[PDB]
A paper describes a structure:
Within this system, SP represents the preferred endogenous agonist of NK1R4. Here, we report three crystal structures of the human NK1R bound to CP-99,994 and the clinically approved antagonists aprepitant and netupitant at 3.27, 2.40 and 2.20 Å resolution, respectively. Overall, NK1R exhibits the canonical GPCR architecture comprising seven transmembrane helices (I–VII) with helix 8 lying parallel to the membrane plane. Taken together, the NK1R structures in complex with different antagonists capture the inactive receptor conformation.
Since the prototypical antagonist CP-99,994 already displays many chemical features that are relatively preserved in further developed compounds we initially solved the structure of NK1R in complex with this ligand. CP-99,994 specifically interacts with only seven residues from helices III to VI and one residue from ECL2 in NK1R. The core (2,3-cis-substituted-piperidine) is laterally wedged between the side chains of F2686.55 and Q1654.60 and capped by I182ECL2. Q1654.60 is positioned to concomitantly hydrogen-bond the piperidine core and the amine linker of arm 1. Mutation of Q1654.60 to either alanine, glutamic acid or aspartic acid severely reduce the binding affinity of CP-99,994. Arm 1 of CP-99,994 extends deep into the receptor core, exploiting a large, almost exclusively lipophilic groove at the base of the orthosteric pocket formed by M2917.39, M2957.43, M812.53, W2616.48, I2045.46, F2646.51 and P1123.32. Within this region, the aromatic methoxyphenyl group of arm 1 is wedged between F2646.51 and P1123.32 and sits above a deep protrusion into the receptor core. Arm 2 of CP-99,994 targets a second lipophilic sub-pocket, making hydrophobic contacts to I1133.33 and V2005.42, and is capped on top by a face-on π-stack with H1975.39. Mutation of H1975.39 to alanine attenuates binding affinity 3.5-fold, yet preserving the aromatic character of this residue by virtue of mutation to phenylalanine results in only a <2-fold reduction in binding affinity to the small molecule, supporting this observed π-π interaction with the receptor. While NK1R in complex with CP-99,994 crystallised in space group C2221, it is noteworthy that crystallisation of NK1R with both aprepitant and netupitant consistently lead to better diffracting crystals in a different condition belonging to space group P212121.
Author numbering: 27 to 226, 1218 to 1413, 238 to 272, 283 to 320
The structure:
């Protein structure tokens, strides 16, 4: 009632309206007016910016004036729209955000499967609006004006079941539809995406040949000399010794296959890891049987492992199961040429020009690939390693870009959950008007935040905001 409190709240609500409409209109201009930005995700973001700007301009003002002044001035039609639009707007924006999380989950988890096209995005947006308006419809249908003694009032006359069941059913249905369900769906999608991205995911500032000394030839000769071997084509395995997973058993079977051939004299093997005692005794058994095989079961520093990746000719990764194949990125960044099973992330990282791929679990195919690598070592291998280094670096810039965007969207959804929790708890409480003023300001402030999040956490949006201003 104090006029300053009223001027305070008038200034705050006007700040919400101007920041939300300016920022969201700027976002729609940024995505639509610039050709490169017309992606599927950005179309859904335009829908959310359209809904948030619309609800700000058409509802924040009247919610403030009618809340403080306790008098309806805008007629029956706008009483219905005032109680109707905000549900549909929240539905359109939050389910546009669900479309964004779903699109990233598709692009990351099943890249080969087709995402829907731009015009298909427009159809999905129209379906989003249909479901939004039809969910919001019952409330706008039951709003009405009561002309009365001192004032006109805008009230929702829910059907007169004495237990107030129909009203409570509608409110729980809306809250589930536009808060809990979308937050759970988006939470599963971005949790899957975030775990697989963080685990993907190599420190390129460390796994880098620049910290190695000398030519690769000098390093290979010094390394083999330290193991008691003389120069040869050098293969390395590093990983846990186990059965049915990291494939050291397939490599040992392949080593026994090569051991009877004359080409085996020209090969060197360095098997590194710890695990099954039988695989350890088998690898050690191969180590005493052949002078070109060396086994290291003790733990090594990562600086020494980087020394190995930069000295050996090839790294063998015969995994049965390899979700991420980070060891291949470590070898390729250091110029070792991978010979790996076509499983999991290894199939995604390695290409025809950047490694040698084989069927998982087939030792003869692996030995044949090792013989092919020996024949390839005859010719210069520098461009092959260059293609491997370029591939490992470019794959990491990808994963970094995806982690940056997905972190931004997580901030968007988090802002949504924070802004809407007090509101939904307030209206579902019945089943303190200063508290209503605060909760209403916080709930309707969410419309101004998305343009700020895009400007701060996304370089493309930052360039577009500096272009407009
Ligand atoms: C900003 O305003 C809104 C924002 C989101 C949803 C709904 C509204 C308006 N609806 C409120 C207002 C009074 C009538 N019902 C209420 C209600 C409360 C909770 C679920 C569903 C409805």
């Amino acid at each position: 009632q104090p006029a300053w409190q009223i001027v305070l709240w008038a200034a705050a609500y006007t700040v919400i309206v101007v920041t939300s409409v300016v920022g969201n209109v700027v976002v729609m201009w940024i995505i639509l007016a610039h050709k490169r930005m017309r992606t599927v995700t950005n179309y859904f973001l335009v829908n959310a910016a359209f809904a948030e700007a619309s609800m700000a301009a058409f509802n924040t003002v009247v919610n403030f004036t009618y809340a403080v002044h306790n008098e309806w001035y805008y007629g029956l039609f706008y009483c219905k729209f005032h109680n109707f639009f905000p549900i549909a707007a929240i539905f359109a924006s939050i389910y546009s955000m669900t479309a964004v999380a779903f699109d990233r989950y598709m692009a990351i988890i099943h890249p080969l499967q087709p995402r829907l096209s731009l015009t298909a995005t427009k159809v999905v947006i129209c379906v989003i609006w249909v479901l939004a308006l039809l969910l919001a419809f019952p409330q706008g249908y039951y709003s009405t004006t009561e002309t009365m003694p001192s004032r006109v009032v805008c009230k929702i006359e829910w059907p007169e079941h004495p237990n107030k069941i129909y009203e409570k059913v509608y409110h729980i249905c809306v809250t589930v539809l536009i808060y809990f369900l979308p937050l759970l769906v988006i939470g599963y999608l971005y949790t899957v995406v975030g775990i697989t991205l963080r685990a993907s995911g190599i420190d390129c500032s460390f796994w880098n040949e620049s910290y190695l000394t000398g030519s690769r030839d000098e390093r290979k000769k010094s390394l083999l000399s330290k193991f008691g071997m003389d120069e040869g084509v050098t293969f390395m395995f590093i990983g846990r010794f186990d059965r049915g997973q990291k494939g050291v058993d397939v490599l040992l079977k392949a080593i026994e296959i090569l051991s009877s051939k004359k080409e085996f004299q020209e090969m060197r093997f360095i098997i590194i890891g710890k695990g099954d005692p039988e695989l350890e005794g088998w690898a050690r058994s191969l180590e005493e049987k052949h002078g070109n095989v060396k086994v290291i079961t003790e733990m090594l520093s990562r600086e020494f492992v980087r020394e190995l990746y930069g000295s050996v000719d090839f790294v063998i990764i015969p995994s049965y199961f390899e979700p991420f194949g980070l060891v291949a990125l470590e070898a390729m960044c250091l110029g070792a040429i991978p010979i790996a099973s076509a499983v999991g992330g290894l199939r995604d990282i390695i290409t025809n020009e950047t490694g040698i791929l084989v069927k998982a679990g087939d030792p003869g195919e692996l030995a044949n690939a090792i013989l092919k690598a020996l024949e390839l070592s005859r010719s210069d291998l520098s461009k092959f390693r260059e293609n491997c280094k370029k591939r490992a670096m470019s794959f990491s810039e990808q994963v970094s870009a995806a982690r940056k965007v997905v972190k931004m969207m997580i901030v968007v959804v988090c802002t949504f959950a924070i802004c809407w929790l007090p509101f939904h708890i307030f209206f579902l409480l019945p089943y303190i008007q200063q508290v209503y003023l605060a909760i209403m300001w916080l709930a309707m402030s969410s419309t101004m935040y998305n343009p700020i999040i895009y400007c701060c956490l996304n370089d493309r949006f930052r360039l577009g905001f500096k272009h407009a201003f």
